[model samples]
Target: GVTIVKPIVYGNVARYFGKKREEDGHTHQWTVYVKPYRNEDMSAYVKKIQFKLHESYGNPLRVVTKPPYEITETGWGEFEIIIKIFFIDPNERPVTLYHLLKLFQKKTVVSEFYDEMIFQDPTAMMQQLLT
Candidate 1:
């Protein structure tokens, strides 16, 4: 059996944070996402995604079990976002991916991280899920 390397991309974007009046004390809009590299659909194998916002926010841990695999919310500050990526099959263990939210003078800031979800000696059924 061989190991299968599935590339995954995770990132966050700060839409707007510049001196805003929309919501008092709120700094900007941050949307973090974990998906298969490129525009391809990964809904089959990548079952769930969890984003852990800063502790200050209410209900910080957000889970997404569907497409887009993203969590968008308004925040007062930036911090390291804890991300968890879950696979469809139990044979594979869940993976934890980390992302940091950065803000700058620009209205929009982008961060992209590249990773691989490797499956070692996957079963016949597990192989189907990755396809």
Candidate 2:
């Protein structure tokens, strides 16, 4: 911890194969990644990174144990993604990062969609909902 500067960790989201639509309701295949700020080898300091995806998707939590810590998925909507970084040093606390998913072609681009679910709400199934 006695260093002149602290190492940085960042993430990215990009369209897969430069295509926007591949199937009905599936607009894009986006990828999320985490690494050092300058793209330096982080294996020396980082032990693992966990990617937390939207609950609607499968396996909400995925852990990467090595370099290229990332996950990819195909969807039309955007949501918040949580990135957790674990360091090799036992004394260091894991870092939490949040990223907003964006797939708009431009800042001016806008779109919307809606759906109706007839399925029962898991929480509502309980006799009393806490929240």
Candidate 3:
């Protein structure tokens, strides 16, 4: 996988709600995203992002079909989030990855990971899209 790569960032930003008003222990409001790195344009190749949350929530699996592929919600505990990226090309199967939602920090914290979607030997039509 050395031909071309799409640099991306996937992580979460958590901000605590100092004093919980009504909820029990859900004291943090967080946002998770899979974004293009360094102002790179990924909209041509990236179709959508699927976010899989804990089963306790309603409609745990969420799909974002637009830019700013992120989800913001309020929760108490920390859990692992499953992220799937779907490309625009038919030959390019979707990419599956994992991201853990960590909000245990006492204050506002950000956790993000960097990765690249490498294309080894791409197809004829697909090759142009990468450029």
- Write the residue-wise lDDT of candidate 2 on 1-131 in tens digits: 12223345454454534455645567666777775555556665567888898899889998988777768777887888888877565445677778777766522232222221111332232212111
TM-score of each: 0.89, 0.67, 0.90
Candidate 3 lDDT, 10-104, residue by residue in tens: 98999988877484667888999998887866777778899999999789999998878999999887899999998888788788889999886
Q: Which stretches of candidate 3 lie over 4 Å from their true place?
A: none
Q: Write the per-residue lDDT of candidate 1 for residues 1-131, one digit (tens) a residue.
A: 77888898888878675576564677778788887785667777777888988888788889898888898887668789999887778668999988888754444688889999889988878787776
Better of 1 and 2 by TM-score: 1
Listed per candidate, the RMSD to the true structure in angstroms reads 1.8, 15.5, 1.9
Candidate of highest TM-score: 3
Candidates ranked by TM-score, best first? 3, 1, 2
Quote model 3's TM-score: 0.90
Model 3 whole-model lDDT (C-alpha atoms): 0.86
TM-score comparison, 1 vs 3, better candidate: 3
Worst 10 residues of 1 by lDDT: 99-108
Candidate 2 runs further than 4 Å off? 4-6, 16-24, 106-131
